[PDB]
Design an enzyme around this catalytic site. Structure first.
Site, PDB file in Angstrom:
ATOM      1  N   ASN A  35      -7.691 -13.296   3.158  1.00  0.00           N
ATOM      2  CA  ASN A  35      -8.516 -14.386   2.333  1.00  0.00           C
ATOM      3  C   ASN A  35      -7.138 -15.454   1.760  1.00  0.00           C
ATOM      4  O   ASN A  35      -7.434 -16.406   1.196  1.00  0.00           O
ATOM      5  CB  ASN A  35      -9.133 -14.055   1.184  1.00  0.00           C
ATOM      6  CG  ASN A  35      -8.527 -13.261  -0.042  1.00  0.00           C
ATOM      7  OD1 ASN A  35      -7.185 -12.860   0.111  1.00  0.00           O
ATOM      8  ND2 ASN A  35      -9.112 -13.011  -0.743  1.00  0.00           N
ATOM      9  N   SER A  62       0.770  -1.173  -0.047  1.00  0.00           N
ATOM     10  CA  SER A  62       0.142   0.130   0.002  1.00  0.00           C
ATOM     11  C   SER A  62       0.948   1.322  -0.070  1.00  0.00           C
ATOM     12  O   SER A  62       2.164   1.130   0.209  1.00  0.00           O
ATOM     13  CB  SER A  62      -0.885   0.032   1.223  1.00  0.00           C
ATOM     14  OG  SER A  62      -0.237  -0.316   2.408  1.00  0.00           O
ATOM     15  N   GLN A 122      -0.412 -15.751   3.732  1.00  0.00           N
ATOM     16  CA  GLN A 122      -0.362 -14.331   4.247  1.00  0.00           C
ATOM     17  C   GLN A 122      -0.400 -14.835   5.808  1.00  0.00           C
ATOM     18  O   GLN A 122       0.137 -14.308   6.613  1.00  0.00           O
ATOM     19  CB  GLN A 122      -1.165 -13.385   3.814  1.00  0.00           C
ATOM     20  CG  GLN A 122      -0.942 -13.039   2.589  1.00  0.00           C
ATOM     21  CD  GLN A 122      -1.783 -11.824   1.826  1.00  0.00           C
ATOM     22  OE1 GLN A 122      -1.027 -10.905   1.142  1.00  0.00           O
ATOM     23  NE2 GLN A 122      -2.762 -11.645   2.303  1.00  0.00           N
ATOM     24  N   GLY A 172      -8.330  -7.398   5.310  1.00  0.00           N
ATOM     25  CA  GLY A 172      -7.348  -7.291   4.085  1.00  0.00           C
ATOM     26  C   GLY A 172      -5.685  -7.049   4.634  1.00  0.00           C
ATOM     27  O   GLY A 172      -5.255  -6.246   3.917  1.00  0.00           O
ATOM     28  N   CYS A 218       4.670  -1.193 -11.358  1.00  0.00           N
ATOM     29  CA  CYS A 218       5.449  -0.162 -10.575  1.00  0.00           C
ATOM     30  C   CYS A 218       5.703   0.934 -11.719  1.00  0.00           C
ATOM     31  O   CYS A 218       5.465   2.253 -11.154  1.00  0.00           O
ATOM     32  CB  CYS A 218       6.769  -0.633 -10.132  1.00  0.00           C
ATOM     33  SG  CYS A 218       6.399  -1.957  -8.898  1.00  0.00           S
TER      34      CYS A 218
END
Ligand SMILES: Nc1ncnc2c1ncn2[C@@H]1O[C@H](CSCC[C@H](N)C(=O)O)[C@@H](O)[C@H]1O
Ligand SMILES: Nc1ncnc2c1ncn2[C@@H]1O[C@H](CSCC[C@H](N)C(=O)O)[C@@H](O)[C@H]1O
Lengths: 336, 336
Positions: free
Chosen positions: A139, A77, A143, A115, A311
């Site tokens: 989800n 983020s 992770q 999330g 990017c």
């Protein structure tokens, strides 16, 4: 020139950075032309039509690769860069601190991170506030596993992770603080999402949302025209929505706004630049890491091209007009 | 030049229209400089500070004069001009029709018009929808009396008028439709106002608000600096607030937005122009009408100068940049 042709040269590394940046900037330029209306009357008609339309709706990379491309906590983020020389690791921490400040986190609170990604914010809050209980919701099994391992290494006892599709998650549990950092852009139905979040709040709770935005209008992240090879390459299934900076003000059925900010787009631009440069520096290692799980040098080159182009494109998007087109919106709400 | 000096010449009719318009345009120009920030980050900080500050807060002209200056129903709010040649009487009716359309008025509903003025909208709805019951609320006995007389002459049986300061009015009565046409600008505490309105709604009600606005920022209608002779002349006590076009989106504690529009400022500009020109045409008659109740030719000239200057100033304000600075905002809400 066809899409097939541009995509041909792109995949072969035959488009230099200068040309690539120029082509992507042009695509974003057309989106701005699409989105800006000649009068405020027309701008609001355009924006409300978008808002109304939303109300009608409803393999994973190895962690070693992610570590070679992103910052220390693998934040995915926009980060916050105080100085020209601020490193991505510093910018991650600064961004975590800004969320803690604006969401009014206090020691002792129950905190839910919706999330949560690789869990940088969950781990930050857990370490800084030892009496908070911090739950991440993701989800992704990979992770969840990564976060629980990191919490173990860091000697944190106040972390848990829910493995769930948030749109399907049912619970009676409430939290003092709910954080949503660049997750809402992935949400199919937003009236329903905010409604669900409200059922996990009490009268004392606050909800903090951070989302990529444009300052003036909303749009889906999808091809602007037949010449646009970029948008669908980045999100080939789609389901990313770029809300305007004020779009969530129209989603107060179930929560009520307390504060509203934006962060200039150069912070996001510097974030994606740092990722691109780190990936570039670690290119050989990255190709080595990916090969086992991808099974061919060609499939590896593809994954890398996709991430690098994301990017390069993000840089043009968020740096446009010195950060004053696409940027990051933040809102603080309480329950009705 | 001092305020005293400019005010001296103004009162003596020694400032020509050209110079007057130029001086007032400059004052509005300084307000724009005050209100526009260099980045959206700063614009939102500025706007939210204003919004937060609001949350901390809390002789009548003879009807013959009003009839000589304003349109047929003595509407004292922006009207809607389809054509260059649309008359103020036509523009009043067009504006009434637009409110009926956007507030979703249907025959049979109970309707409350808050700050109903001389009752043009109350009378319009009562005539067009015979099974509606229509109540106007005003703090002026003279206005109540005027409305009830007009309803009598028009053979309307479905009109009533509440004489009340709305901020003090207590009732258990609810209404299917609540309309607020350029009244909220006069409101001291707006969180409290919207809260009070919500207690007069059911789950089936709608609330329609129309207010003068600037498209980007909010401001009180008060002197921009020491050179500003205008603002305090027009509103010497003050208590007029110009909300931004999106300011009421932050006042959804008790109601929830369904739709949002703006009307370009040239409609308001054409409204004040029509008033100014009609007053000018009827100048001799107006001076004759006012004299009895004002007691001297000097006091009459003062009242007329004030009203005429208000129209001249309003023209510059709302016509600025072809109607794309100050304009009219409209919002439709339901109860939480
Ligand atoms: N329906 C859903 N349920 C749970 N997580 C979801 C989801 N849709 C998307 N996500 C996750 O939300 C995250 C958005 S990316 C941001 C991750 C993290 N907040 C950070 O700042 O780094 C991704 O991990 C994405 O996979
Ligand atoms: N506290 C209050 N209670 C009731 N009426 C009020 C009020 N404060 C202002 N008003 C009235 O609200 C009106 C705003 S002017 C608009 C009048 C009418 N809606 C029209 O469109 O022509 C004025 O009549 C003003 O005197």
């Amino acid at each position: 020139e066809s899409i097939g042709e541009i995509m041909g040269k792109l995949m072969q590394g035959e488009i230099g950075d200068e040309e690539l940046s120029k082509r992507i900037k042009e695509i974003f330029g057309k989106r701005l032309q699409w989105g800006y209306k000649p009068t405020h009357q027309q701008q609001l008609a355009f924006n409300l039509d978008f808002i109304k339309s939303l109300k009608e709706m409803d393999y994973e990379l190895p962690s070693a690769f992610l570590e070679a491309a992103f910052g220390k906590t693998i934040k995915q983020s926009g980060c916050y860069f105080k100085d020209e020389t601020t490193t991505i690791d510093e910018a991650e921490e600064a961004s975590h601190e800004l969320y803690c400040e604006r969401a009014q986190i206090k020691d002792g609170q129950t905190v839910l991170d919706i999330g949560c990604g690789q869990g940088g914010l969950v781990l930050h809050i857990a370490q800084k506030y030892k009496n908070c209980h911090v739950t991440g919701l993701t989800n992704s099994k990979a992770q969840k596993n990564y976060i629980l391992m990191q919490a173990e290494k860091l000697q944190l006892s106040n972390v848990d992770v829910i493995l769930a599709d948030v749109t399907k998650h049912e619970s009676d549990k409430t939290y003092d603080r709910i954080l949503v950092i660049e997750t809402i852009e992935h949400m199919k139905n937003i009236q329903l999402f905010m409604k669900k979040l409200s059922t996990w709040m009490t009268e004392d709770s606050l909800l903090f949302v951070d989302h990529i935005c444009h300052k003036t209008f909303s749009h889906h992240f999808e091809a602007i025209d037949e010449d646009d090879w970029y948008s669908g390459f980045i999100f080939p299934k789609g389901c990313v929505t770029i809300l305007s900076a004020s779009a969530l003000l129209y989603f107060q059925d179930d929560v009520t706004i307390l504060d509203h900010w934006v962060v200039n787009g150069m912070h996001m631009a510097r974030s994606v630049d740092a990722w691109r440069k780190k990936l570039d520096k670690n290119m050989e290692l990255a190709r080595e890491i990916l090969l086992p799980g991808l099974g061919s040098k060609e499939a590896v080159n593809g994954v890398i091209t996709h991430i690098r182009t994301f990017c390069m494109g993000g840089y043009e998007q968020f740096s446009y007009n010195n950060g004053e087109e696409w940027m990051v919106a933040q809102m603080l709400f309480k329950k009705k």
